[PDB]
Amino acid sequence: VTNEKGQAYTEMLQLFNLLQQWNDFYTAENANNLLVACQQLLINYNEPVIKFINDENEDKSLLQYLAGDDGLAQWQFYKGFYNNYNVHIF
């Protein structure tokens, strides 16, 4: 049980650091938005997010793990997510 809580904290920090590369952190509001966006990704899309975190490929996309290879599905997911959290997940 102790390992599982430690792993969840590591997964959240890893996802946050990856998404931070595509998100401006100048404002405190955006920093809060990315934190909320990461916790909603881990709660609703755990298996996709864990695959994305553990992928060592330079061209890896979280959208591919979340919506598959269909660009229109990826776009519709991204647009819905960005409207809700103001966070980039490319």
Partner: protein, 457 residues
């Protein structure tokens, strides 16, 4: 680049500038260099710890390493020359990195005179130009802001390099800290120089491909020569030599749904009578879907900041947090979710514990199915006291496959309605803040995009 251009670009670089050198590039290059040799024992692991620590504090590993190489090793001093060591190698490196970051942001003036050997030899014209550059051109967090105030040698190196010579300063020959650090970083291979729109394009290309996919299926003959339609397209004879291509309504819905809703478009699911049937229901007021898809025409107000006219129009009791207590969403980590408000508020309005799940994932778009499976009616009419399920684009639904849910608390003569919501901006889950949003009516052909369900009786 001449030496003056190197110094100028280097002092104007950010204190955290990597200079094109990673911590891994530096670890091999700093072996044998002063404290990296004496304190880290040339250990790649200890060197990486120091360089990562200074980087995390906001100091360039390349700048910190170049400084140590030029300054040299004195056992009595810490990573910053003329300072005692602070604890162990790592603690002292972190202390020096914090001092450099503080100094760079600090109020400061160039140190025109050496404190140890005070000789004023720098022309007042040079001092005025260097003071202007340091105060107006050199922003906070720059290399020059960290070093120029600390020593006269740094001030002379930046604005009067001839002052480093004993001839000019009348004391001794001084090293050029900026040129020596710049040359060391360049010698190491470091360099001194001083949005989903495509996704939109890919989406359009997919739609074009989707048009191809619809066409893949073979057509059937409708009646005789007059027509030749399938389920997506109609071939209708126009004249002896003419056929006009119409499109089946399904096709428009098939992709039109894709435009707004990625999956589940409209299921032509069993609905409710156009008649309000208030008698049929427990109570409350309803309005017919009026078209004008629209969306939230105002909202996310807490009860305190809700405009009085909308507050007066609320026909349901104000939400009481006591209904949340004992919530099944607390155990699942779903505290403050829109489904939790729908469950608790419908429990308050209907007087019975409402369903949270039906052995499937329950979310904003599908919660109406959980209630319907328990005998909860459901309708396309926004009805006061009824829960709603909305796929993305509707009633504040932002995520495809998740949707949004809440309770209709008022309906207006223009067909607009007020909703009570959780997990919407600015109060995301798990805040449990009730937010009121005005919605612009309902599209006539929304179907399962928007569903309005009652509470179980």
């Amino acid at each position: 680049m001449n030496d003056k251009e190197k110094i100028d670009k280097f002092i104007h670089s950010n204190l955290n500038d990597d200079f094109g050198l990673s911590v891994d590039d530096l670890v091999g290059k700093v072996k044998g260099i002063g404290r990296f040799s004496a304190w880290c024992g040339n250990s790649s692991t200890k060197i990486k710890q120091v360089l990562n620590a200074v980087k995390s504090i906001g100091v360039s590993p390349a700048l910190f390493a170049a400084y140590e190489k030029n300054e040299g090793y004195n056992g009595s001093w810490g990573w910053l020359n003329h300072t005692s060591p602070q604890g162990n190698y790592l603690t002292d490196a972190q202390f020096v990195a914090r001092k450099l970051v503080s100094q760079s942001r600090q109020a400061g003036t160039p140190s025109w005179i050496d404190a140890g050997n005070p000789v004023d030899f720098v022309p007042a014209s040079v001092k005025r130009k260097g003071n202007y550059d340091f105060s107006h051109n050199m922003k906070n967090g720059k290399v020059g802001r960290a070093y120029i105030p600390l020593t006269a040698a740094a001030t002379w190196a930046a604005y009067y390099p001839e002052g480093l010579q004993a001839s000019y300063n009348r004391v001794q020959n001084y090293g050029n800290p900026f040129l020596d650090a710049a040359n060391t970083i360049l010698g190491w291979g470091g360099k001194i120089d001083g949005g989903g729109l495509d996704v939109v394009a890919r989406a359009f290309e997919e739609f074009l491909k989707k048009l191809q996919d619809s066409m893949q299926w073979d057509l059937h003959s409708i009646g005789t020569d007059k027509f030749f339609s399938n389920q997506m397209f109609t071939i209708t004879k126009t004249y002896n030599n003419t056929y006009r291509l119409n499109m089946n309504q399904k096709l428009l819905d098939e992709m039109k749904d894709l435009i707004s809703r990625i999956d589940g478009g409209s299921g032509n699911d069993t609905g409710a009578d156009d008649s309000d049937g208030d008698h049929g229901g427990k109570a409350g007021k309803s309005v017919a879907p009026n078209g004008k898809s629209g969306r939230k025409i105002g909202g996310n107000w807490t009860y305190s900041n809700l405009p009085q006219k909308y507050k007066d129009a609320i026909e349901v009791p104000k939400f009481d947090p006591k209904y949340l207590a004992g919530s099944p969403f607390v155990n699942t980590g779903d505290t403050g979710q829109c489904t939790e408000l729908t469950w608790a508020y419908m429990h308050q309005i209907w007087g019975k514990r409402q369903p949270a799940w039906d052995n499937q994932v329950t979310n904003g778009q599908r919660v109406w199915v959980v209630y319907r499976n328990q005998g909860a009616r459901v309708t396309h009419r926004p009805t006061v006291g009824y829960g709603f399920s909305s796929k993305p684009n509707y009633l504040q639904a932002m995520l495809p496959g998740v949707g949004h849910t809440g309770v209709v608390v008022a309906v207006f003569k223009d067909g607009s309605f007020l909703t009570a919501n959780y997990n919407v901006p600015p109060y995301w889950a798990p805040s449990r803040v009730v937010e009121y949003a005005l919605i612009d009516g309902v599209p006539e052909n929304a179907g399962d995009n928007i569903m309005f369900f009652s509470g179980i009786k």
